[PDB]
Amino acid sequence: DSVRAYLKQIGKVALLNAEEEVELAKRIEAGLYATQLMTELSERGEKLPAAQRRDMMWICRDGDRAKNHLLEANLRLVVSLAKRYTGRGMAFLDLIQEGNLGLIRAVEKFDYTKGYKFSTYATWWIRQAITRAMADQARTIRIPVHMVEVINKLGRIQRELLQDLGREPTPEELAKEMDITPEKVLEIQQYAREPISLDQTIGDEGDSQLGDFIEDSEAVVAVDAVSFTLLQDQLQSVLDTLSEREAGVVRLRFGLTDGQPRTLDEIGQVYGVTRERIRQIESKTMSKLRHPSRSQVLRDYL
Amino acid sequence: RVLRGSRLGAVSYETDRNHDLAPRQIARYRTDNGEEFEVPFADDAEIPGTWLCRNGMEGTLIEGDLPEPKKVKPPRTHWDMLLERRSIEELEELLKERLELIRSRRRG
Amino acid sequence: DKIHARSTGPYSMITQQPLGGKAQFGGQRFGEMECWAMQAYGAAYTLQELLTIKSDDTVGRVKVYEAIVKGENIPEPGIPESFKVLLKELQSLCLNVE
Amino acid sequence: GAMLDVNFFDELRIGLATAEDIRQWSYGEVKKPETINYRTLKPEKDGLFCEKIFGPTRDWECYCGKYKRVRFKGIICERCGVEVTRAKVRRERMGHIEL
Amino acid sequence: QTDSFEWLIGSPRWRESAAERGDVNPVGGLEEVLYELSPIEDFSGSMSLSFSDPRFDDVKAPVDECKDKDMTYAAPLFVTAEFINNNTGEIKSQTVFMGDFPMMTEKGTFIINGTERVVVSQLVRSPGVYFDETIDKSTDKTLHSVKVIPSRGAWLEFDVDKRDTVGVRIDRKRRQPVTVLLKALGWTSEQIVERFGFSEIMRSTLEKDNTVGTDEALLDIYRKLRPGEPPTKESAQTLLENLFFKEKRYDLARVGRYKVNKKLGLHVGEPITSSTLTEEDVVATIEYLVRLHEGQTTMTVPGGVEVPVETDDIDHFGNRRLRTVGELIQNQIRVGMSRMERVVRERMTTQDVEAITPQTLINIRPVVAAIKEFFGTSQLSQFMDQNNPLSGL
Amino acid sequence: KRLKVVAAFQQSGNSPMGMVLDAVPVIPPELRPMVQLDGGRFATSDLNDLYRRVINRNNRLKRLIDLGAPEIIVNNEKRMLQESVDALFDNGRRGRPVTGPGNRPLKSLSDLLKGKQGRFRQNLLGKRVDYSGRSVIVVGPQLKLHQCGLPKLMALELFKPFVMKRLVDLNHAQNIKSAKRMVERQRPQVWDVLEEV
Amino acid sequence: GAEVRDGDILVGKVTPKGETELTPEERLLRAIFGEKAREVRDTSLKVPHG
DNA sequence: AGCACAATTTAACACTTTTGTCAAGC
DNA sequence: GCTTGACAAAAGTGTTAAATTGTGCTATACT
Ligand SMILES: C/C=C/C/C=C(\C)[C@H](O)CC/C(C)=C/C=C(C)/C(O)=C1/C(=O)C=C([C@H](C)CC/C=C/NC(=O)OC)OC1=O
Ligand SMILES: [Zn+2]
């Protein structure tokens, strides 16, 4: 048990009290300003004397020690809070860790001179970071936090209007309720629509995965491919059925030779003629091409 | 019962023209651990010296340009979180406090 | 209710494979009993064709289809797909493979 | 000894993979536990579908879309940051993670 | 199917039905659920909730229409539930909509969303006092044993060890002497040999009991039961009684108690109740067991007619009961109401005091969820194969 | 026993140093596809959340080291990490494997092994090939030994490529597509060329 | 009351398919044939086999 | 939970040049 | 055969605005 192992780990230290908070915070303050003046003399400020050096570094080290100390003391409260959020979405130890981080942040930004309990000011940062990471890493598809909040309000109001109406309310009722549009509600729900796994068996006799019944609608028709090939083949035949500059212009205008269709600009460029000469060209060409004589074979490829 | 799917990408089908390709440039970027990664870029393509390479870390160009190294500071320090909320004079108070503290400790 | 055959239909999504199941086309699975069997017979090419160009060769499938449409000698069986898949798996299991 | 796997297979040696060979393999290290946009429905940078490491899911189509012609290939839109190519190397390429 | 269903209903049809053959208390399965759930009270005991009158409403639509429009043929559920604060005492009586509830066809089936399923009755050997003596051929000795497996309870063995000793392994423990139980049960070695004079292995083990005094046995039991735990003296009675006599976490069925007394002729002339056990039960157990590994034919316990000394069968019907349709339904009802009450008691304190109503206290969502997930999503709730009237039947 | 593995490494030019892992590989995404069905709620491949846990823990403990933290939680997170990695390779091997909704266990990479016969040689059950047809069987007492009956409808679907080719050889279908839709139409001369094919 | 056979159309249903660069070839066929794009994809109901 | 703000994204739109079009005659 | 001038629709261009989204913040006490 890593859970209970860490539990025994954390029970190893006892709690503290007000003056504990008092002296530990004041110690850590002393250490931080000590290291501050330390880096002050880090740039050229002085040949720092021996006793001053020893006890300033000592103050630093001591504030650090008490720093870890209080955190340790409050880890029990960390667990006592985080216990009540599990059974949903995200694993427990990770919740523990992130509550630890939020503990870090709160104890960082904590004041004693406001003369409160440490835990009180802590709990804000605590549950904040907790629920934050909750919205963060509870979906394999990440979602904006405000999206999460609106979804939460949605589900709340949903159970509300359920027990009120006695039945599942209407989506129009709901959109009316949260003062947004029904399609907006729909989009919200869909975004609030969790994915499903492909590693369960649809059959009650379990031998086939659920993913063994998914038609790949973006797969290869294949015969269509050779169809496309022979398409090109009869194509080039018909291209050769007519004059040169015709087919050249056509391939250039359709990207048929390069994959990039050229405008009348490029075409009359390479030929040295006007656009509108090319337009005459194209007119006569599509006239010639638009013959049932020519399209009898060709119509089939549609 | 039919259940179809589709990966979210397009699949065309041309012929593999090995002969005719867009010509293109080649660059050498250096990493922190002096790694050299090389990327064929288009001819008409700026070669930005910075690039996170196959290494996965960020890698700069082979050359020396140095437009702007960082232009960015650290986010915060717990020093700062205290400093905004506590005075330098408070700091010196607790400082000389602990000075006499350690004194009247071991050295009385 | 039982009569059913197939040549070519809707390929897989996970694997590259045209759907089994007589609700859809589906078809018949040539597995372990008549493999070991074909080996017993000694005929190898048919088995190879089955396990390659009717099983996994993505390109080879349309290739063979083309060849049949054109009335031409069969292309050669390409590499299986699940083979390479297992290969990548073994790799990603932190395993020097080659 | 040929990773492209064309018809010539004398022996098949196995062995423990070195960390170098690992990092020698991958084309980049993912660094975001992300998959795809809920809304645009597309992969994410440093996510477990980043085409920059994996490759395009769309045949010869850079991420920004600056190119969509197979004549463009062996190249990368610096803006998109992914190589215009076939869309099946994703079937092949491996990603790594430094702990 | 009709009768299971109506009993679970408790319809007056069934009311006169069971009344036809005694059945002094015609109780429907739902009534049973009420009596087994009520009252509802806080651990502080400051406030009290209760139920009454599980009353069916008419179906919301006709069977043909329900099938066609794919609405599962059901009907509402109303309950005369009542809350009262133990602190001062005030009635909070509501007739709560328990939820729309499916209704059996007149062909004994059910329509879910227009779909037509069939529930199946599942065979199970009932919970009971189960006997056997597998001869240790390596010892060439019959090894008489017992495993009294209750519903929602713990196991226990009265084993004929290879030695002339007691196989008093209990609740999956690995081994006990009977003496530890008796002194743990408030029995002196005098009391045991008195109660068990012809008991040869009993006298032997009581010579090898190697522990004297009740509380010594109590502490040994407690430590061996919670090994890795500090022994405490009040847990002597305040654990075992909870383990095997506090009938809130250890309760074989009423039919289990019935099977017990009937196998033993203990509760000869009274209706079945109190699924908790009794030292009476255990001692008659031990007496019959030792006599079975004694050479016997039948033994009349004080207060009980002599039961013929013999083994038991898991295969024989006399143990193999039949969980019916209404049976399984009540099982689902119980499992849902468990979750629902353990959240009512949750709010029971968190709910504001002297301002709540059971309406504020009630959540039928989990129960209806269980109902739905039972009708659907169950290998016992299966599609009626209607290829013809025959195979349908 | 020990000298076995000792000589194994010694003989080998390998190194047991690689036995520890420091940099983790990742499967291609295609083999772990996030494929889509019709409507927006798509399909996944069982490894994604594994990698997610790994990434989250790694980044977390990374920034933890960055900050400088009491080593207790450091070791805790590291243990968590190693557990995650083990779950990835073969979860359920050590401790209890990792959770979701639906009362049903996990599947590491180890479980994706096709053969994957451990301690029992079950049935094999490969990929169910193509180009067959099933049916019930009946006697051909009139038939010769070498022969075999056949539902014309069935083989009709069978030789579709062959028949289409041979018929477009005839002047009966201009393109292949004509042939295929004609197969859908079954114009009786279809049966005629079916004969020869 | 209409007779039917496998593959025949059951219900005329359709949805948009989206937008992709047409092949030059298909564009040519449309041009010679004056045929529109109709990006909405053809998703009807056909009777399955047999 | 909720608010604040902040960067970041994108879409909207006003304008411009470009390209396809025409009608012209030449 | 062919060019001209003119013409509008269309592809960009770019700016600005709106929305979107990542991030930080809260002080009775509660281990
Ligand atoms: C890359 C290989 C690494 C080592 C192998 C491992 C880990 C596999 O775990 C065992 C081998 C195996 C099984 C792989 C299955 C794959 C690739 C797959 O997907 C199949 C498949 O599932 C079935 C088949 C054939 C139908 C199996 C026929 C066996 C015949 N045996 C025989 O002829 O008797 C001597 O091919 C495949 O490629
Ligand atoms: Zn791009």
JSON list of C-alpha atoms in Angstrom, two decimals, chain A residues 149-239:
[
{"chain": "A", "resi": 149, "resn": "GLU", "atom": "CA", "xyz": [-17.55, 25.84, -14.26]},
{"chain": "A", "resi": 150, "resn": "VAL", "atom": "CA", "xyz": [-20.47, 26.34, -16.61]},
{"chain": "A", "resi": 151, "resn": "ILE", "atom": "CA", "xyz": [-20.82, 22.57, -16.95]},
{"chain": "A", "resi": 152, "resn": "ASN", "atom": "CA", "xyz": [-20.84, 22.26, -13.18]},
{"chain": "A", "resi": 153, "resn": "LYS", "atom": "CA", "xyz": [-23.55, 24.88, -12.82]},
{"chain": "A", "resi": 154, "resn": "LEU", "atom": "CA", "xyz": [-25.40, 22.98, -15.52]},
{"chain": "A", "resi": 155, "resn": "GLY", "atom": "CA", "xyz": [-25.32, 19.63, -13.76]},
{"chain": "A", "resi": 156, "resn": "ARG", "atom": "CA", "xyz": [-26.20, 21.32, -10.47]},
{"chain": "A", "resi": 157, "resn": "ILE", "atom": "CA", "xyz": [-29.27, 23.01, -11.94]},
{"chain": "A", "resi": 158, "resn": "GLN", "atom": "CA", "xyz": [-30.04, 19.72, -13.67]},
{"chain": "A", "resi": 159, "resn": "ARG", "atom": "CA", "xyz": [-30.32, 17.68, -10.49]},
{"chain": "A", "resi": 160, "resn": "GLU", "atom": "CA", "xyz": [-32.16, 20.64, -8.98]},
{"chain": "A", "resi": 161, "resn": "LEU", "atom": "CA", "xyz": [-34.82, 20.82, -11.68]},
{"chain": "A", "resi": 162, "resn": "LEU", "atom": "CA", "xyz": [-34.91, 17.02, -11.71]},
{"chain": "A", "resi": 163, "resn": "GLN", "atom": "CA", "xyz": [-35.99, 16.72, -8.09]},
{"chain": "A", "resi": 164, "resn": "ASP", "atom": "CA", "xyz": [-38.15, 19.81, -8.52]},
{"chain": "A", "resi": 165, "resn": "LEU", "atom": "CA", "xyz": [-39.91, 18.79, -11.72]},
{"chain": "A", "resi": 166, "resn": "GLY", "atom": "CA", "xyz": [-39.65, 15.22, -10.45]},
{"chain": "A", "resi": 167, "resn": "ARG", "atom": "CA", "xyz": [-38.48, 14.18, -13.90]},
{"chain": "A", "resi": 168, "resn": "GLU", "atom": "CA", "xyz": [-35.64, 15.07, -16.21]},
{"chain": "A", "resi": 169, "resn": "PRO", "atom": "CA", "xyz": [-36.51, 18.65, -17.20]},
{"chain": "A", "resi": 170, "resn": "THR", "atom": "CA", "xyz": [-36.57, 19.77, -20.76]},
{"chain": "A", "resi": 171, "resn": "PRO", "atom": "CA", "xyz": [-33.42, 21.16, -22.38]},
{"chain": "A", "resi": 172, "resn": "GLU", "atom": "CA", "xyz": [-35.45, 24.23, -23.30]},
{"chain": "A", "resi": 173, "resn": "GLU", "atom": "CA", "xyz": [-36.43, 24.59, -19.66]},
{"chain": "A", "resi": 174, "resn": "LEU", "atom": "CA", "xyz": [-32.76, 24.31, -18.74]},
{"chain": "A", "resi": 175, "resn": "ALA", "atom": "CA", "xyz": [-31.55, 26.89, -21.26]},
{"chain": "A", "resi": 176, "resn": "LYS", "atom": "CA", "xyz": [-34.35, 29.10, -19.99]},
{"chain": "A", "resi": 177, "resn": "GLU", "atom": "CA", "xyz": [-33.04, 28.48, -16.49]},
{"chain": "A", "resi": 178, "resn": "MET", "atom": "CA", "xyz": [-29.36, 29.34, -16.96]},
{"chain": "A", "resi": 179, "resn": "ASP", "atom": "CA", "xyz": [-30.42, 32.20, -19.23]},
{"chain": "A", "resi": 180, "resn": "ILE", "atom": "CA", "xyz": [-28.66, 30.91, -22.35]},
{"chain": "A", "resi": 181, "resn": "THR", "atom": "CA", "xyz": [-29.82, 29.34, -25.47]},
{"chain": "A", "resi": 182, "resn": "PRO", "atom": "CA", "xyz": [-30.94, 25.72, -25.77]},
{"chain": "A", "resi": 183, "resn": "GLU", "atom": "CA", "xyz": [-28.42, 24.93, -28.50]},
{"chain": "A", "resi": 184, "resn": "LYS", "atom": "CA", "xyz": [-25.84, 26.52, -26.23]},
{"chain": "A", "resi": 185, "resn": "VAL", "atom": "CA", "xyz": [-26.90, 24.05, -23.55]},
{"chain": "A", "resi": 186, "resn": "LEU", "atom": "CA", "xyz": [-26.58, 21.28, -26.11]},
{"chain": "A", "resi": 187, "resn": "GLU", "atom": "CA", "xyz": [-23.04, 22.28, -27.04]},
{"chain": "A", "resi": 188, "resn": "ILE", "atom": "CA", "xyz": [-22.20, 22.46, -23.35]},
{"chain": "A", "resi": 189, "resn": "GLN", "atom": "CA", "xyz": [-23.53, 18.96, -22.74]},
{"chain": "A", "resi": 190, "resn": "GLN", "atom": "CA", "xyz": [-21.65, 17.60, -25.73]},
{"chain": "A", "resi": 191, "resn": "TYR", "atom": "CA", "xyz": [-18.41, 19.15, -24.55]},
{"chain": "A", "resi": 192, "resn": "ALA", "atom": "CA", "xyz": [-19.48, 17.59, -21.30]},
{"chain": "A", "resi": 193, "resn": "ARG", "atom": "CA", "xyz": [-19.87, 14.27, -22.99]},
{"chain": "A", "resi": 194, "resn": "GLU", "atom": "CA", "xyz": [-17.14, 11.80, -21.91]},
{"chain": "A", "resi": 195, "resn": "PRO", "atom": "CA", "xyz": [-15.51, 9.33, -24.33]},
{"chain": "A", "resi": 196, "resn": "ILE", "atom": "CA", "xyz": [-15.91, 5.57, -24.18]},
{"chain": "A", "resi": 197, "resn": "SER", "atom": "CA", "xyz": [-13.33, 2.78, -24.22]},
{"chain": "A", "resi": 198, "resn": "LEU", "atom": "CA", "xyz": [-12.77, 0.24, -26.98]},
{"chain": "A", "resi": 199, "resn": "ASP", "atom": "CA", "xyz": [-11.69, -2.51, -24.59]},
{"chain": "A", "resi": 200, "resn": "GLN", "atom": "CA", "xyz": [-15.04, -3.88, -23.45]},
{"chain": "A", "resi": 201, "resn": "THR", "atom": "CA", "xyz": [-17.03, -6.64, -25.12]},
{"chain": "A", "resi": 202, "resn": "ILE", "atom": "CA", "xyz": [-20.37, -5.75, -26.73]},
{"chain": "A", "resi": 203, "resn": "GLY", "atom": "CA", "xyz": [-21.24, -9.43, -26.71]},
{"chain": "A", "resi": 204, "resn": "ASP", "atom": "CA", "xyz": [-22.33, -10.92, -23.41]},
{"chain": "A", "resi": 205, "resn": "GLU", "atom": "CA", "xyz": [-20.11, -13.78, -24.48]},
{"chain": "A", "resi": 206, "resn": "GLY", "atom": "CA", "xyz": [-16.87, -11.84, -24.30]},
{"chain": "A", "resi": 207, "resn": "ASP", "atom": "CA", "xyz": [-14.62, -12.56, -27.26]},
{"chain": "A", "resi": 208, "resn": "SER", "atom": "CA", "xyz": [-14.90, -9.50, -29.54]},
{"chain": "A", "resi": 209, "resn": "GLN", "atom": "CA", "xyz": [-13.75, -6.02, -28.63]},
{"chain": "A", "resi": 210, "resn": "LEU", "atom": "CA", "xyz": [-16.08, -3.08, -29.19]},
{"chain": "A", "resi": 211, "resn": "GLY", "atom": "CA", "xyz": [-13.64, -1.68, -31.75]},
{"chain": "A", "resi": 212, "resn": "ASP", "atom": "CA", "xyz": [-14.15, -4.76, -33.94]},
{"chain": "A", "resi": 213, "resn": "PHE", "atom": "CA", "xyz": [-17.39, -3.31, -35.34]},
{"chain": "A", "resi": 214, "resn": "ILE", "atom": "CA", "xyz": [-16.31, 0.15, -36.50]},
{"chain": "A", "resi": 215, "resn": "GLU", "atom": "CA", "xyz": [-16.62, 0.69, -40.23]},
{"chain": "A", "resi": 216, "resn": "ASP", "atom": "CA", "xyz": [-13.76, 2.90, -41.32]},
{"chain": "A", "resi": 217, "resn": "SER", "atom": "CA", "xyz": [-15.73, 5.46, -43.30]},
{"chain": "A", "resi": 218, "resn": "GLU", "atom": "CA", "xyz": [-12.47, 7.18, -44.30]},
{"chain": "A", "resi": 219, "resn": "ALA", "atom": "CA", "xyz": [-10.94, 4.00, -45.72]},
{"chain": "A", "resi": 220, "resn": "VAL", "atom": "CA", "xyz": [-10.04, 3.08, -49.28]},
{"chain": "A", "resi": 221, "resn": "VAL", "atom": "CA", "xyz": [-12.72, 2.11, -51.81]},
{"chain": "A", "resi": 222, "resn": "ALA", "atom": "CA", "xyz": [-9.83, 0.90, -53.88]},
{"chain": "A", "resi": 223, "resn": "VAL", "atom": "CA", "xyz": [-11.68, -0.01, -56.83]},
{"chain": "A", "resi": 224, "resn": "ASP", "atom": "CA", "xyz": [-12.28, 3.73, -57.06]},
{"chain": "A", "resi": 225, "resn": "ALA", "atom": "CA", "xyz": [-8.51, 4.14, -57.23]},
{"chain": "A", "resi": 226, "resn": "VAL", "atom": "CA", "xyz": [-8.03, 2.09, -60.39]},
{"chain": "A", "resi": 227, "resn": "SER", "atom": "CA", "xyz": [-11.16, 3.83, -61.63]},
{"chain": "A", "resi": 228, "resn": "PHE", "atom": "CA", "xyz": [-9.30, 7.11, -61.16]},
{"chain": "A", "resi": 229, "resn": "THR", "atom": "CA", "xyz": [-6.31, 5.63, -62.95]},
{"chain": "A", "resi": 230, "resn": "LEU", "atom": "CA", "xyz": [-8.24, 4.57, -66.04]},
{"chain": "A", "resi": 231, "resn": "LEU", "atom": "CA", "xyz": [-10.01, 7.90, -65.79]},
{"chain": "A", "resi": 232, "resn": "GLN", "atom": "CA", "xyz": [-6.63, 9.55, -66.29]},
{"chain": "A", "resi": 233, "resn": "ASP", "atom": "CA", "xyz": [-5.85, 7.10, -69.06]},
{"chain": "A", "resi": 234, "resn": "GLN", "atom": "CA", "xyz": [-8.86, 7.77, -71.27]},
{"chain": "A", "resi": 235, "resn": "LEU", "atom": "CA", "xyz": [-8.34, 11.38, -70.24]},
{"chain": "A", "resi": 236, "resn": "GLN", "atom": "CA", "xyz": [-4.86, 11.66, -71.74]},
{"chain": "A", "resi": 237, "resn": "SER", "atom": "CA", "xyz": [-6.09, 9.77, -74.77]},
{"chain": "A", "resi": 238, "resn": "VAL", "atom": "CA", "xyz": [-8.78, 12.37, -75.36]},
{"chain": "A", "resi": 239, "resn": "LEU", "atom": "CA", "xyz": [-6.30, 15.17, -74.68]}
]
